Design a binder for this molecule. Structure first.
Ligand code: ATP
Ligand code: ADP
Ligand code: MG
Ligand code: MG
Lengths: 537, 556
């Protein structure tokens, strides 16, 4: 509604130039036919150096005046909507990064990229091909309404009710079919992302023909929606012209109330027949902009979606002891409620010792680690870090002190140094080489070209699984944390390396929480917690 | 420019019919004041209702044909992308490929649809306006057809500028898309490191790179709009200058140059609009440059064979196989591999991280071609077998298995020609041990798993992957680090499958794992380190022969 007005608001200086270059543009082109008639009507008899040369000279200046101001209009319009489209895309992506972790479960990644790409172009390409038409049409109806008019304006009474109910039912149908077109495009885009991203699984089963056939079915559903939208628009335009003929004949049916003469009536018949089919452009174009703006409301709902995260933290101590306490925590995932995962856990963590959490698969060990990093909020009880709730600490402070290693790590595309120093605004190569030595990752780093600046593919596709795990450990260790969480860290590694990295508390001032699938994995931990079916024993 | 006409050749019959209706509409709109009919006058009523029906008919055919062209073009581009080799999908990320398929094809189709209609409208309008020029005044039609090619010089020279700006814009659009999808796919990791500002800065860097080129496409259009309307003014004025001289010095045809003036001005109006198409044609060429490279690119992989034997055994022979990755040659990952797999026998492959165990598994699935000796399956090379038949007999699990976003019954039966039967799905899930937790779900096999298996636990995503590979009855089975985090019931089912199943003699299994319990029972153990086989033999022989394998097992 009014959001697009505030959105394009910092483009008004370039906008007010566009209506500046438009007023004198249409002014020039309306006066050109007058001087064109000045030249032609004197070809019966003309004087060589007289106003015939002046008529040509006067006509060419107004060609100069109209064409130059017309070029500056299009240049201003073409640039100003590159600015609008790139501003929309930035605000949408910035607001999409603040949402909670449960929001990304409901929506697919391919669908989100589709609205970020396709819908922003539609929401910016509405007026360009028509705003020149809109104000030119507004100018002409203003100029023409300045002849024989004893009751000419009578036609003004009949030109107000242009079957507004028929316009309203068409506007509802047009915004309906524009919504399904956007949804069908987003469904087809997800098919491309799923088949291309996971290619190695697709090629391993020889199922490339299945993914091609699925895309062909998705394209046909889009095509049937495209043809439906074009059909009703062409059907509506034909129906509108039939009514224009009807009202014109009905108005002229009362044309013999006095037969003011015949010649006076026929003089304005052409101009009346013009604006009869020329005011329909006004209601059509204005209706299009109203429907096209409201047909991309999925983007605007995303930009003003308030996440269910708590209030942002403000506490930031200069010295953290590192004590973590769980007090009767009860948790159930927000997208699938009414099914508890954790039930009444209660334990404490101390910086001097190493705590081991063991249990079977599907028990909730990684849910505990995810809740410990303030990724989710418990539905009962609370979790306390240094005698304070963990949600009161700053977002950029808490995650710099409490780091963790996931079950299967994901490495973003870029250099190895960028992945090791991920999340840090600045990190000298002294720190990176110090952390790479701790995780025993310097052995294979030297074998690659360019050293630590070599490329790593998407999701670490150009690395071994063992080498990917060592980069994740070095990435967490370079932050120098106070609380360290290890969630199945030493599984993909070989026997020799995982035995070398078993202490994790050489300094002795870090809280270490090791999470293992079996009890035999951990043997030196001071405190061992056995977690069965989501309830501590 | 002729490369764009390939996609329009499928609908030449409908386009020709639309061309006929274009000619009829153009002829009627010109010879309309010539007759004028030579309840007082319903002539305007029948004229308008006839000119509206043909407009509606012509719009219906053009819109339907343009819809069919766009849908056909997008399908062919995606088909040619998936046909390429595996190295192609590593040079280009998934963000770039999505932008080329989805964005560039829609941009090219929209530009082609909006321009082809008004080009054909104003070509037959100019041609029919020229036909009424040769008889109105013969002597002035030759001067305006020799000056007309002079206006084409400037758009021809600056035409390359438009497409060079377009290839940089489409490149910048694709790079920004790759940043967005990569951040959104790994959101829990991004939030865990508090790096939302880092992703925002990376997106803003690509957007400001777009802005520094989109200013250049606004000045270019403003300059072009001036030069495409001043040349029109020079054409129309220069006729009057010569025409004025012929009135006062030449013939007495001043009553005949009157009818030439109106037709000349309308002919000029059609020329300027027809001259305002050429910059948009070069823009469409620049937008479609990348997707036309994908279409005619020959893949660097051998074609699929034609052999499909009914009876096959899993006899795989390695004969001096050495492989180096195509994106980084002269670094031999493998070196002198030589071993055989026999049906009913389990071979265990062990070694340190980075040895190349997963590279051997990728070679055995015909993902990459070796750069050394032959790799034979039942005495015949892998590329000699059909694509849909080789991957049915040979199945694998993978180090990090991937699950697609659909129901589990559609996930276990993925890739299968035909549609397997439901009992089949339960039979494989029971065998793989996954049926214990599938029945615990409220909907059973109909639970649509989310993307990247977020709702699935650790060892559950490898139990489904094991059931998916076993449902096609493979002849060669590859287990790539699957039995490391499996439950007690699944581990017992794996041991029965590997060593106690009745169908053990039907298939040959290659086992890649660090679990010493399963390795110690294997019939052959191969130690891989540095890309070459160090020691080979049974578990007892490796203990007695001492050395590398002895040190690894006795570490705890
Ligand atoms: N796509 C790739 N491009 C280039 N080099 C690669 C690629 N994949 C792996 N490598 C390199 O090949 C070597 C071994 O790779 P591979 O994944 O086969 O190891 P592996 O021994 O099977 O791994 P692990 O047992 O740790 O899972 C390493 O030096 C690795 O960096
Ligand atoms: N996005 C989600 N929506 C609903 N439930 C989830 C989601 N992610 C995880 N869970 C639940 O949380 C648990 C994940 O922790 P878990 O798999 O037990 O880790 P581990 O098995 O390694 O201990 C699972 O039982 C799963 O049911
Ligand atoms: Mg877990
Ligand atoms: Mg591997």
């Amino acid at each position: 509604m009014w959001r697009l007005l505030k959105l394009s608001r910092p483009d008004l200086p370039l906008l007010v130039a566009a209506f500046f270059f438009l007023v004198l543009a249409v002014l020039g082109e309306t006066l050109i036919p007058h001087y064109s008639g000045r030249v032609i009507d004197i070809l019966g008899g003309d004087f060589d150096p007289h106003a015939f040369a002046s008529a040509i000279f006067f006509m060419c200046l107004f060609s100069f005046g109209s064409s130059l101001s017309a070029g500056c209009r299009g240049g201003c319009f073409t640039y100003t909507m590159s600015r609008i489209n790139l501003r929309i895309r930035e605000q949408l992506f910035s607001s999409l990064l603040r949402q909670d972790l449960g929001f990304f479960q409901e929506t697919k990644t391919g669908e989100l990229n589709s609205r970020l790409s396709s819908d922003t172009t539609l929401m910016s390409n509405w007026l360009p091909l028509n705003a020149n038409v809109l104000l030119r049409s507004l100018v002409k109806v203003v100029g023409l309404y300045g002849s024989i008019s004893p009751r000419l304006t009578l036609l003004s009474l009949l030109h107000m009710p242009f079957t507004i109910a028929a316009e309203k039912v068409y506007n509802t149908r047009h915004q309906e079919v524009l919504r399904e077109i956007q949804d069908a495009v987003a469904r087809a885009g997800q098919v491309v992302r799923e088949a291309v991203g996971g290619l190695q699984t697709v090629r391993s089963f020889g199922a490339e023909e299945h993914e091609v056939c699925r895309y062909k079915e998705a394209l046909e559903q889009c095509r049937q929606l495209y043809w439906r939208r074009d059909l009703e628009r062409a059907l509506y335009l034909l129906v509108r012209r039939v009514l224009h003929l009807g009202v014109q004949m009905l108005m002229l049916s009362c044309g013999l109330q006095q037969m003011l003469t015949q010649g006076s009536l026929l003089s304005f018949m052409i101009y009346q027949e013009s604006v009869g089919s020329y005011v329909q452009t006004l209601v059509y174009i204005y209706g299009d902009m109203l429907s096209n703006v409201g047909a991309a409301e999925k983007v605007f709902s995303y930009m003003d979606r308030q996440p269910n995260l708590p209030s942002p933290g403000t506490l930031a101590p200069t010295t953290l002891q590192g004590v973590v306490k769980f007090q009767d925590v009860s948790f159930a995932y927000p997208n699938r409620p009414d099914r508890p995962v954790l039930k009444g856990l209660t334990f404490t963590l101390r910086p001097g010792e190493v705590t081991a959490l063991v249990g079977p698969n599907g028990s909730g060990k990684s849910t505990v680690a995810a809740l410990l990093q303030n990724l989710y909020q418990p539905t009962g009880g609370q979790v306390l870090l240094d005698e304070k709730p963990i949600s009161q600490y700053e977002h950029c402070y808490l995650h710099s002190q409490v780091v963790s290693v996931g079950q299967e790590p994901v490495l973003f595309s870029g250099s190895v140094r960028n992945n090791i120093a991920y999340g840090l605004q600045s990190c000298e190569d002294d720190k990176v080489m110090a952390a790479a030595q701790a995780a025993h990752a310097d052995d294979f780093i030297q074998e690659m070209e360019h050293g630590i600046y070599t490329d790593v593919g998407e999701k670490g596709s150009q690395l071994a699984a063992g080498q990917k795990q060592r980069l994740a450990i070095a990435r967490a260790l370079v932050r120098d944390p106070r609380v360290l969480i290890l969630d199945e860290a030493t599984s993909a590694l070989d026997v020799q390396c995982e035995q070398a990295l078993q202490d994790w508390n050489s300094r002795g001032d870090r809280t270490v929480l090791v999470i293992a699938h079996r009890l035999q994995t951990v043997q030196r931990a001071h405190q061992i917690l056995v977690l069965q079916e989501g309830k501590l024993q | 420019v002729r490369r764009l006409l390939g996609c329009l050749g499928s609908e030449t019959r409908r386009l020709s019919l639309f061309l006929v209706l274009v000619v009829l509409s153009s002829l009627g709109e010109m010879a309309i004041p010539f007759f004028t009919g030579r309840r007082n006058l319903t002539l305007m009523s029948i004229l308008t209702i006839a000119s509206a029906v043909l407009e509606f008919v012509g719009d219906g055919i053009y819109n339907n044909t343009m819809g069919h062209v766009h849908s056909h073009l997008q399908g062919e581009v995606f088909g040619a992308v998936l046909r390429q080799e595996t190295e192609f999908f590593q040079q280009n990320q998934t963000g770039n490929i999505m932008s080329r398929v989805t964005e560039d094809t829609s941009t090219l189709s929209d530009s082609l649809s909006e321009n082809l209609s008004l080009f054909l409208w104003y070509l037959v309008r100019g041609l029919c306006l020229l036909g009424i020029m040769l008889w109105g005044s013969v002597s002035l039609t030759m001067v305006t057809l020799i000056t007309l090619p002079l206006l084409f010089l400037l758009p021809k020279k600056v035409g390359k500028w438009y497409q060079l700006l377009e290839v940089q814009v489409r490149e910048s659009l694709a790079k920004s898309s790759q940043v967005a999808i990569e951040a959104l796919s790994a959101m829990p990791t991004v939030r865990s490191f508090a790096n939302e500002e880092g992703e925002a800065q990376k997106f803003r860097e690509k957007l400001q790179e777009i802005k520094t080129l989109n200013q250049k496409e606004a000045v270019a259009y403003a300059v072009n709009s001036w030069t495409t309307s001043i040349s029109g003014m020079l054409l129309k004025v220069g006729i009057l200058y010569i025409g004025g001289q012929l009135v006062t010095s030449g013939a007495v045809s001043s009553g005949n140059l009157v009818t030439f003036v109106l037709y000349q001005m309308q002919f000029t109006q059609a020329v300027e609009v027809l001259l305002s198409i050429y910059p948009r044609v070069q823009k469409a060429v620049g937008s479609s440059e990348k997707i036309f490279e994908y279409l005619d690119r020959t893949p660097r992989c051998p074609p699929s064979g034609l052999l499909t034997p009914l009876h096959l055994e899993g006899l795989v022979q390695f004969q001096d196989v050495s492989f180096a990755y195509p994106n980084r040659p002269d670094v031999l990952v493998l070196q002198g591999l030589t071993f055989t797999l026999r049906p009913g026998e389990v071979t265990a492959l062990v070694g340190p991280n980075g040895s190349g165990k997963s590279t051997v598994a990728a070679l055995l699935q015909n993902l990459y071609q070796p750069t050394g000796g032959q790799l034979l399956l039942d005495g015949k090379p892998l590329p000699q077998y059909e694509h849909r038949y080789l991957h049915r007999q040979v199945a694998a699990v993978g180090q990090e298995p991937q699950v697609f976003g659909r129901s589990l019954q559609e996930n276990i039966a993925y890739g299968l020609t035909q549609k397997p039967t439901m009992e089949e799905i339960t039979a494989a899930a029971v065998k793989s041990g996954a049926h214990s937790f599938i029945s615990g779900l409220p909907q059973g096999y109909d639970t649509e798993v989310d993307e990247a298996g977020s709702q699935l636990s650790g060892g559950q995503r490898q139990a489904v992957a094991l059931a998916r590979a076993l449902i096609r009855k493979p002849c060669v089975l590859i287990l790539d680090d699957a039995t490391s985090a499996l439950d007690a019931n699944s581990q017992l089912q794996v041991e029965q499958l590997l060593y106690e199943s009745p169908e053990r003699y039907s298939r040959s299994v290659l086992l890649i794992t660090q679990h010493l319990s399963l390795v110690e029972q294997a019939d052959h153990i191969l130690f891989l380190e540095g890309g070459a086989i160090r020691e080979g033999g049974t578990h007892q022989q490796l203990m007695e022969k001492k050395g590398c394998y002895w040190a690894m097992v006795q570490a705890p």
